[PDB]
């Protein structure tokens, strides 16, 4: 069979979650982290990287690496550290169309697009749909001044929502 689990670049761990998955297959665990960490060395440690594992019945494994998820690109592209809790009602981040295009450029080099063999226009048409899921609104001409006020209010609002979440965590501990 084939296993495709996202793994942070260079942070592969023998323990769960990917750990027990390998144990059932019977493939060596340490070897994966060894080869993977040494293959994603250049990539920043902590980048969400979808990884596909080609597992033969003999248990021989050939690892496969792809480009990072779109979430990671969009998130940082706006400066936002965490997407919005609610979509359509609040705007997580503000990124230009350029940012969506730049992600599309480097994201069209992955294995999925080669198989999908679509043109450049479709590449962006698929990243604008993900940004909305995050809450990140795209604006033709966003301005630093607008960005500063919008992000500051969101960060404070996120802290307010975090405070509400923290209160719920206390209730969860009680129960």
């Amino acid at each position: 069979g084939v296993i495709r689990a996202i793994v942070r670049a260079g942070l592969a761990m023998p323990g769960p979650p990917l750990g027990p998955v390998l144990g059932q297959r019977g493939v060596s665990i340490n070897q994966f982290c060894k080869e993977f960490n040494e293959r994603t060395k250049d990539i920043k440690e902590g980048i969400p990287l979808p990884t596909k594992i080609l597992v033969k019945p003999d248990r021989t494994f050939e690892i496969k690496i792809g480009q990072p998820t779109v979430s990671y690109f969009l998130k940082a592209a706006a400066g936002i550290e965490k997407g919005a809790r609610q979509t359509g009602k609040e705007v997580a981040g503000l990124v230009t169309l350029k940012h969506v295009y730049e992600i599309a450029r480097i994201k069209a080099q992955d294995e999925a697009f080669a198989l999908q063999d679509v043109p450049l226009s479709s590449v962006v048409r698929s990243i604008i749909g993900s940004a909305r899921s995050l809450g990140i609104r795209v604006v033709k001409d966003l301005s630093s001044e607008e960005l500063a006020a919008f992000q500051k209010e969101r960060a404070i609002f996120l802290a307010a929502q975090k405070e509400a979440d923290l209160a719920a965590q206390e209730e969860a501990a009680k129960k």
């Binding site: 084939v2 080669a114 198989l115 063999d117």
Partner: protein, 130 residues
């Protein structure tokens, strides 16, 4: 029984016909294959290799193609299409590149190839590759 009024053509049916009117225009050579039994993972690699060779693999329903062929100049193309069918298109004639990949899959047969606006059988297609 009272004859029914002719059913209106669905917009999708028109869209499929519109696509056909561009295939031959865009890509000079179109090749017909029949074996769709190949597994998805092997199929994915087959398209990926075709892209490496600037060739595109696409499947269209013969339901719409068959009327078009009777109207189009390539009437003799119609008999080839039966059951499951697929199409290989490439504006540049990468005949040798296609043939060598098909040889790797014995159970996949090339029924015929329409190249240079000419219906050529598989046997004649090989000679063209040389």
């Amino acid at each position: 029984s009272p004859p029914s009024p002719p059913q209106e053509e669905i917009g999708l049916i028109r869209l499929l016909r519109r696509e056909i009117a561009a295939v031959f225009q865009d890509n000079r050579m179109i090749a017909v294959c029949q074996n769709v039994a190949l597994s998805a993972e092997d199929k994915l690699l087959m398209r990926h290799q075709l892209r490496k060779h600037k060739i595109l693999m696409k499947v269209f329903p013969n339901q719409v193609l068959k009327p078009f062929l009777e109207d189009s100049k390539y009437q003799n193309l119609l008999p080839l299409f039966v059951g499951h069918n697929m199409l290989l298109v490439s504006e540049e004639p990468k005949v040798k590149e296609m043939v060598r990949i098909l040889r790797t899959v014995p159970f996949l047969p090339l029924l015929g190839g329409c190249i240079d606006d000419t219906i050529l059988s598989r046997q004649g297609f090989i000679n063209y590759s040389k």
